[PDB]
Amino acid sequence: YTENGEWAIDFCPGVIRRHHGGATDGPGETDVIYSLIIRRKPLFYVINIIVPCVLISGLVLLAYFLPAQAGGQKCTVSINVLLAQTVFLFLIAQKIPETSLSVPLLGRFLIFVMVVATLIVMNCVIVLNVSQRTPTTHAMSPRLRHVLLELLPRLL
Amino acid sequence: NGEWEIVHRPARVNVDPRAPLDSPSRQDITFYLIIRRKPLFYIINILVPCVLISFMVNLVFYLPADSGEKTSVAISVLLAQSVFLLLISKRLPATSMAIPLIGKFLLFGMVLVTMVVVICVIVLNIHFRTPSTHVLSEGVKKLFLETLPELLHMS
Amino acid sequence: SDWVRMGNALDNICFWAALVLFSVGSSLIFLGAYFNRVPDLPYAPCIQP
Amino acid sequence: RTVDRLCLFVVTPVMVVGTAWIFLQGVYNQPPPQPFPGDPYSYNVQDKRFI
Amino acid sequence: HFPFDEQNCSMKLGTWTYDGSVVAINPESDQPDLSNFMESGEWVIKESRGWKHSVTYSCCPDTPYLDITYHFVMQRLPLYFIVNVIIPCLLFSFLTGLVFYLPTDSGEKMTLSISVLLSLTVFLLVIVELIPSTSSAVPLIGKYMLFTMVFVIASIIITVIVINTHHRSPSTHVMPNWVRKVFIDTIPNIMFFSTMK
Amino acid sequence: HFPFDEQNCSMKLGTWTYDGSVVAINPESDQPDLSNFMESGEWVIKESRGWKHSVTYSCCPDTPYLDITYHFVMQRLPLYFIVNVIIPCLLFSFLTGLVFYLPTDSGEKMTLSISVLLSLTVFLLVIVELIPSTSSAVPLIGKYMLFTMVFVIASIIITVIVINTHHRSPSTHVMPNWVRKVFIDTIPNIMFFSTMKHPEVKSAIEGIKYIAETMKSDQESNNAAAEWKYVAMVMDHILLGVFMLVCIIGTLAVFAGRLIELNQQG
Amino acid sequence: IENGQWEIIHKPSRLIQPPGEGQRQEVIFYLIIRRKPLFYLVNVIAPCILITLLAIFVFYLPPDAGEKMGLSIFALLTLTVFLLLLADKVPETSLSVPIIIKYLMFTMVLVTFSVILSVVVLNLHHRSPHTHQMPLWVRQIFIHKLPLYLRLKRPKLPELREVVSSISYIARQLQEQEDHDALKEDWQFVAMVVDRLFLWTFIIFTSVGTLVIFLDATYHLPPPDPFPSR
Ligand SMILES: *[C@@H]1O[C@H](CO)[C@@H](O[C@@H]2O[C@H](CO)[C@@H](O[C@@H]3O[C@H](CO[C@H]4O[C@H](CO)[C@@H](O)[C@H](O[C@H]5O[C@H](CO)[C@@H](O)[C@H](O)[C@@H]5O)[C@@H]4O)[C@@H](O)[C@H](O[C@H]4O[C@H](CO)[C@@H](O)[C@H](O)[C@@H]4O)[C@@H]3O)[C@H](O)[C@H]2NC(C)=O)[C@H](O)[C@H]1NC(C)=O
Ligand SMILES: *[C@@H]1O[C@H](CO)[C@@H](O[C@@H]2O[C@H](CO)[C@@H](O[C@@H]3O[C@H](CO[C@H]4O[C@H](CO)[C@@H](O)[C@H](O)[C@@H]4O)[C@@H](O)[C@H](O[C@H]4O[C@H](CO)[C@@H](O)[C@H](O)[C@@H]4O)[C@@H]3O)[C@H](O)[C@H]2NC(C)=O)[C@H](O)[C@H]1NC(C)=O
Ligand SMILES: *[C@@H]1O[C@H](CO)[C@@H](O[C@@H]2O[C@H](CO)[C@@H](O[C@@H]3O[C@H](CO[C@H]4O[C@H](CO)[C@@H](O)[C@H](O)[C@@H]4O)[C@@H](O)[C@H](O[C@H]4O[C@H](CO)[C@@H](O)[C@H](O)[C@@H]4O)[C@@H]3O)[C@H](O)[C@H]2NC(C)=O)[C@H](O)[C@H]1NC(C)=O
Ligand SMILES: *[C@@H]1O[C@H](CO)[C@@H](O[C@@H]2O[C@H](CO)[C@@H](O[C@@H]3O[C@H](CO[C@H]4O[C@H](CO)[C@@H](O)[C@H](O)[C@@H]4O)[C@@H](O)[C@H](O[C@H]4O[C@H](CO)[C@@H](O)[C@H](O)[C@@H]4O)[C@@H]3O)[C@H](O)[C@H]2NC(C)=O)[C@H](O)[C@H]1NC(C)=O
Ligand SMILES: CCCCCCCC/C=C/CCCCCCCC(=O)O[C@@H](COC(=O)CCCCCCCCCCCCCCC)COP(=O)([O-])OCC[N+](C)(C)C
Ligand SMILES: CC(C)CCC[C@@H](C)[C@H]1CC[C@H]2[C@@H]3CC=C4C[C@@H](O)CC[C@]4(C)[C@H]3CC[C@]12C
Ligand SMILES: CC(C)CCC[C@@H](C)[C@H]1CC[C@H]2[C@@H]3CC=C4C[C@@H](O)CC[C@]4(C)[C@H]3CC[C@]12C
Ligand SMILES: CC(C)CCC[C@@H](C)[C@H]1CC[C@H]2[C@@H]3CC=C4C[C@@H](O)CC[C@]4(C)[C@H]3CC[C@]12C
Ligand SMILES: CC(C)CCC[C@@H](C)[C@H]1CC[C@H]2[C@@H]3CC=C4C[C@@H](O)CC[C@]4(C)[C@H]3CC[C@]12C
Ligand SMILES: CC(C)CCC[C@@H](C)[C@H]1CC[C@H]2[C@@H]3CC=C4C[C@@H](O)CC[C@]4(C)[C@H]3CC[C@]12C
Ligand SMILES: CC(C)CCC[C@@H](C)[C@H]1CC[C@H]2[C@@H]3CC=C4C[C@@H](O)CC[C@]4(C)[C@H]3CC[C@]12C
């Protein structure tokens, strides 16, 4: 026996079933059912899809550490992680099953990281909107200033 | 059929006078199908996106040079056109009898987008000149600050 | 400069929020698989070691 | 800016006209009225050729 | 209505060479037998039914032609297309409008909009490989994709106009009176008005 | 060791229903006949040989079961995978380290790094299309792809750290003494770079004074920022050297072992 | 039924005798067929030429625009997309490399070198004049000798006492800023000269390599005779 490159056979019980033995059913029927309980070896998906996707999706957290200036390229990092995740979606669509009884783990994870990347893009847009406010266009809100500069460090 | 509409559907008895009467190739009956493609799928999913993405490259001429995002827009349009070409490449055979119409438009758009990138490079080169790098002659000033703007009805 | 400092504080707190969100969600999704082992069935292994 | 405006007015009409020519080649592409050029017969059930 | 489409697919069965005057076929039951039906991961059979039909042509009065047609009404399970098609398109649609909250001085508006466009273009591979390549009608998925694409393009165009407006100066343009009237006086009165003039 | 992998596939042949006691099979020759073998564009048959085997089971001591197993040892020809897969990965890995020679003030560091990542991500489609997809083990191409990906990710993270260090405001942040000791004082010694009375009249007089003090304060702030910029500069040079060395050493550690083994076998 | 991708050049038939029973003759029908490459010219070669032209023109983009990196690296990304396009079409054997793959990898190497040399130019342009001092050989080569060959012409009472001190301080600061600007302009001019040198070098290398590969492809004709002497 040479084990399949992707599937390990964990169990294989067999059962002889008899049914339709009732008077209304008429003549009895029988069969033999073997149940191959097989385990996937996920190494290919781990190395080629999941690990690169996890790292690329972790990169959006770095946007919080780039400056909120013209040359910071905060949104560059965030939206290009989204583009890379779209490439990974195209890659994953070639492999996943095409049923609708449940959502696969790979698809759930990819949609989750895409949603997180979208939220972080919105966050970066908001931070850039707040940071580049100038006296010649925007007025000084004292409430937000007291909340963020004075109250937050003492609360934190 | 979901993609093909039958226009004509004739039937003919073809007899080859040149072949001998004892040849299988003498006689046949041919049923022809002239079929027109229904292009709604290709229109919606390829042509309108591809054509609009190609046309957006002309927006770079209205972008100011100080935005710092001109050649990026143009080269990204070129990249999207390349993605569309990758899309087309899987759908048709690699025959040499003619270039497909969508292929013709994609080649034309790629060439024009490349010219637009070159133009953007030249425009940015002109925009960032200074006295320590270039000399602004009087003829160039007369041509580009008075004469061409009045012909072009510029503000 | 006041505007920049406000942006910095927002960035600081939202980094921790995003880190917790990403880490917790990924961990939950993958621990869903961690508890999806083949059940301990009352049968011998298919291949005897 | 002047070069950019001139290039707008030169390049955008070229793009529009070229795309229009390429796609009007195809939009007005139809199969011929008869299945066989040179043969006026339509090979339709309406035009029966009785013996 | 794809991927929320309901289909009605039939199986017409008949004696190919025997007509009703020599061989007669009758249904065993009003409905097909679904007792040994395997569960489908893509469709749900809501209704199923078999009907007998007899057709007599004017040229053959004496030989009726019989058939039994079994039809099945099938509702698609849309979760796969919801997860793999609709949600990314919705995320792109949401990301489209965020450029208008970005300041122009950030120098990243075109970066954001063009990257959303590039994501949509790359996603086009997924959509055309998944969407049915038929021209009978436009699916709902195709309509939503075209909506998203058209409006990211519109956002790009309007963003170029906004960036052009932001960078104007007296050395290049003179402010029209109507622009001042519309945008500096009237609109900010019906806005938050939290911005200096 | 893919694509430098050697394979050994067998072809076991036997009489399905006849045992050795009624039908005996013998090889015609010790080796398979390769006289009419067409040349392969992907594999070279190093070795070939056929072996006869006889097995007697405990419950059938009088019916030995015979088989002939032919086997072929084949070496893959790796030029196609070297050209189509390895060389683009080498180019991306080499470009990964060039961000550390790109100054922060260019405003293009993240553009370069993230777009190198995007090119590698698009090329992952090429890799998945070309190489086989199996989970028996990690191929050498798989190890190299993962090394390149982690290399790009680490480059992005450290680039973000460098950019953060470059842009540190001197008002909000105060330079630690240890940072100055390592980066401004100690490290550059090893390197070769330079270290770091009407009212209106009185009002005008005070205005000139205020202007002078304002430029003085601006000079102090600019110098304090320049200290951070110098630190980021020194880190960038060190990281450029480190990343080029890591690229070379990683490529060698991935490939040179199997290359040396194949060289020793010929 | 004429094939859309193949032209039949020759089509002979031969009787092959056995070498020198079990011996068997053969009748071999040969088809020498030439591929008609219009599809690959439209879909691969011309985009590669355009990408190559943009990779050349990045060296004319001024450093102050902050756009060299994006242009060069998106050119590389587009080339990766075309590698994905070719992955479905090219043969998978390992006896030799297709010439189109050679041209693709050649263009990838040119775009990579354009990226590298753009980084070098940007490093020179943004070089800090205080941390860095221009070495004398750099001055001689890139400011005096090379610009002539490249046709680059470089153009060209306590209150009163305290006020005097403030004015002198302001003038001294402006003079120091002027010296800093002079050093920064020297570095920028050297970057410009290096950029023009790389532009001409890329033009020459691109033209030579493209011409060599294109002439190698064009002069590969089908055999005039089905059975040439070897
Ligand atoms: C779809 O595709 C089908 C084919 O699959 C097309 O059908 C073809 O249409 C054309 C035009 O209608 C036909 O050509 C015409 O053929 C007739 C008849 O000639 C044939 O039959 C003769 C016996 O009846 C026989 O002698 C002929 O052989 C001689 O000629 C051929 C060349 O045609 C030569 O090779 C031989 O050595 C012989 O010398 C031949 O087998 C013919 O009379 C027509 O001539 C008229 O048109 C030509 C136009 O060039 C003109 O030059 C003449 O002066 C004359 O006016 C013409 O050749 C063809 O036979 C059809 N093919 C079939 C049925 O298989 C159909 O048109 C397509 N539909 C579209 C595009 O919508
Ligand atoms: C999915 O698609 C299928 C088509 O594949 C549709 O199937 C049709 O279903 C309807 C019922 O909903 C069928 O209509 C019924 O046909 C019966 C059989 O007709 C044959 O036999 C009679 C008697 O000899 C002939 O007169 C007739 O010409 C046929 O040869 C009729 O007996 C039924 O009559 C009943 O309804 C009518 C309504 O007008 C009453 O007047 C009658 O008194 C009686 O109550 C009825 O006409 C139809 O034939 C099916 N067509 C097929 C199978 O081709 C499904 O409906 C569709 N599903 C959905 C959800 O849309
Ligand atoms: C690639 O993979 C194949 C398939 O596994 C390997 O094939 C094996 O090759 C080795 C030789 O390298 C074989 O070993 C030889 O088997 C011979 C036949 O054995 C049968 O017959 C004898 C006699 O009846 C029985 O005793 C035995 O049980 C079998 O039924 C033996 O005759 C050989 O003996 C020689 O070597 C031994 C070494 O211990 C000496 O003691 C002997 O005196 C004599 O010199 C030898 O044992 C093996 O059987 C093959 N297995 C198969 C085909 O399944 C390849 O080796 C491998 N190639 C690589 C890795 O490069
Ligand atoms: C497409 O592919 C086919 C093969 O599938 C090629 O056909 C071969 O072409 C070569 C060169 O034309 C042939 O080689 C020549 O064979 C001649 C006949 O040899 C036969 O007969 C002699 C006895 O008369 C036997 O000894 C021999 O084994 C053969 O059975 C020789 O006379 C030729 O010799 C001449 O050329 C050689 C070159 O090395 C000189 O050394 C000699 O002195 C002399 O000048 C030569 O050996 C070969 O036989 C063909 N194979 C066939 C028909 O199966 C096509 O060429 C190729 N087409 C292309 C690439 O366009
Ligand atoms: C894309 C072509 C069509 C659109 C053109 C748009 C032009 C619009 C009109 C330009 C008006 C310029 C007015 C101000 C300057 C006037 C003085 C002057 O001419 O010298 C200035 C240049 O001036 C140029 O901008 C010349 C055109 C670009 C040069 C690049 C090569 C040709 C075009 C692209 C290749 C075409 C072929 C391949 C691609 C198709 C200063 O020159 P320099 O910097 O000291 O040295 C240049 C050296 N070089 C030429 C080697 C770089
Ligand atoms: C958007 C973020 C928050 C979540 C991203 C992951 C998405 C795809 C997840 C989150 C919750 C999930 C659902 C949770 C539970 C069920 C019920 C089950 O009988 C079928 C699958 C279904 C319907 C899941 C489908 C996938 C799902 C919608
Ligand atoms: C800018 C707008 C117009 C979008 C771009 C439209 C482009 C792709 C053009 C090229 C060819 C055109 C088609 C050609 C022919 C027809 C006529 C009629 O059957 C309805 C419209 C339809 C089907 C056109 C729709 C638009 C179309 C697909
Ligand atoms: C990703 C983060 C943000 C949200 C996670 C929510 C959790 C609770 C969701 C995500 C995916 C979900 C699973 C998706 C599908 C199935 C299969 C179904 O037959 C039973 C429920 C089950 C097993 C769901 C349970 C709940 C679940 C684990
Ligand atoms: C110029 C750009 C937008 C390229 C696309 C142009 C398309 C949208 C235009 C160009 C000319 C147009 C055609 C001109 C005239 C007619 C006849 C009428 O029955 C409407 C459809 C139809 C057949 C049009 C369809 C759309 C069309 C093909
Ligand atoms: C707002 C700006 C950017 C334009 C947006 C894209 C426009 C031009 C798109 C969006 C929807 C498109 C239409 C969608 C479907 C059809 C029906 C078919 O006959 C093809 C042409 C036609 C009629 C398209 C023409 C082009 C179209 C109107
Ligand atoms: C263009 C340069 C700068 C970069 C790409 C290098 C390419 C062209 C190199 C890398 C490996 C090379 C191949 C290596 C070995 C062989 C086998 C023999 O038949 C000679 C040519 C041939 C087939 C070479 C052709 C050129 C080749 C494919």
Swiss-Prot record, chain B:
Superkingdom per UniProt: Eukaryota
Mutagenesis or variant effect for residue 82 to F: In CMS3A; delayed closure of AchR ion channels, increasing the propensity for open-channel block, as well as a reduced rate of channel opening
Protein name: Acetylcholine receptor subunit delta
UniProt keyword terms in alphabetical order: Cell membrane, Congenital myasthenic syndrome, Disease variant, Disulfide bond, Glycoprotein, Ion channel, Ion transport, Ligand-gated ion channel, Membrane, Phosphoprotein, Postsynaptic cell membrane, Receptor, Signal, Synapse, Transmembrane, Transmembrane helix, Transport
UniProt lineage: Eukaryota, Metazoa, Chordata, Craniata, Vertebrata
Disease linkage: Multiple pterygium syndrome, lethal type: Multiple pterygia are found infrequently in children with arthrogryposis and in fetuses with fetal akinesia syndrome. In lethal multiple pterygium syndrome there is intrauterine growth retardation, multiple pterygia, and flexion contractures causing severe arthrogryposis and fetal akinesia. Subcutaneous edema can be severe, causing fetal hydrops with cystic hygroma and lung hypoplasia. Oligohydramnios and facial anomalies are frequent.
Effect on the protein of changing residue 83 to A: Increased length of channel opening
Family statement drawn from the similarity comment of this UniProt entry: Belongs to the ligand-gated ion channel (TC 1.A.9) family. Acetylcholine receptor (TC 1.A.9.1) subfamily. Delta/CHRND sub-subfamily.
Keyword match Transmembrane helix: yes
Curated annotation (Swiss-Prot), chain C:
Subcellular location, record wording: Postsynaptic cell membrane; Cell membrane
Spans within the Extracellular topological domain: 37-49
Transmembrane segments: 13-36
Family, as annotated: Belongs to the ligand-gated ion channel (TC 1.A.9) family. Acetylcholine receptor (TC 1.A.9.1) subfamily. Epsilon/CHRNE sub-subfamily.
Quaternary structure note: Pentamer of two alpha chains, and one each of the beta, delta, and gamma (in immature muscle) or epsilon (in mature muscle) chains. The muscle heteropentamer composed of alpha-1, beta-1, delta, epsilon subunits interacts with the alpha-conotoxin ImII.
Role summary: After binding acetylcholine, the AChR responds by an extensive change in conformation that affects all subunits and leads to opening of an ion-conducting channel across the plasma membrane.
Protein name: Acetylcholine receptor subunit epsilon
Phylogenetic lineage: Eukaryota, Metazoa, Chordata, Craniata, Vertebrata
Shown residues in whole-protein numbering: 445 to 493 of 493
From Swiss-Prot, chain F:
Included stretch of the parent chain: 154 to 457 of 457
Annotated source species: Homo sapiens
Family label: Belongs to the ligand-gated ion channel (TC 1.A.9) family. Acetylcholine receptor (TC 1.A.9.1) subfamily. Alpha-1/CHRNA1 sub-subfamily.
Domain of life: Eukaryota
Ranges per topology, Cytoplasmic: 101-111, 165-236
Gene: CHRNA1
Keyword DNA repair found: no
Subcellular location: Postsynaptic cell membrane; Cell membrane
Glycosylation: residue positions: 8
Protein name in UniProt: Acetylcholine receptor subunit alpha
Entry's transmembrane regions: 80-100, 112-132, 144-164, 237-257
From Swiss-Prot, chain G:
Record: disease: Myasthenic syndrome, congenital, 2A, slow-channel: A form of congenital myasthenic syndrome, a group of disorders characterized by failure of neuromuscular transmission, including pre-synaptic, synaptic, and post-synaptic disorders that are not of autoimmune origin. Clinical features are easy fatigability and muscle weakness affecting the axial and limb muscles (with hypotonia in early-onset forms), the ocular muscles (leading to ptosis and ophthalmoplegia), and the facial and bulbar musculature (affecting sucking and swallowing, and leading to dysphonia).
Subunit structure: Pentamer of two alpha chains, and one each of the beta, delta, and gamma (in immature muscle) or epsilon (in mature muscle) chains. The muscle heteropentamer composed of alpha-1, beta-1, delta, epsilon subunits interacts with the alpha-conotoxin ImII.
Stated consequence of mutating residue 81 to A: In CMS2A; slow-channel mutation; increases gating equilibrium constant by 33-fold, owing to increased opening rate and decreased closing rate; no effect on the choline dissociation rate constant
TM segment ranges: 37-61, 69-87, 103-124, 197-215
Name the record gives this protein: Acetylcholine receptor subunit beta
Stated family: Belongs to the ligand-gated ion channel (TC 1.A.9) family. Acetylcholine receptor (TC 1.A.9.1) subfamily. Beta-1/CHRNB1 sub-subfamily.
Full-protein residues shown: 203 to 501 of 501
UniProt superkingdom: Eukaryota
Organism from which the protein derives: Homo sapiens
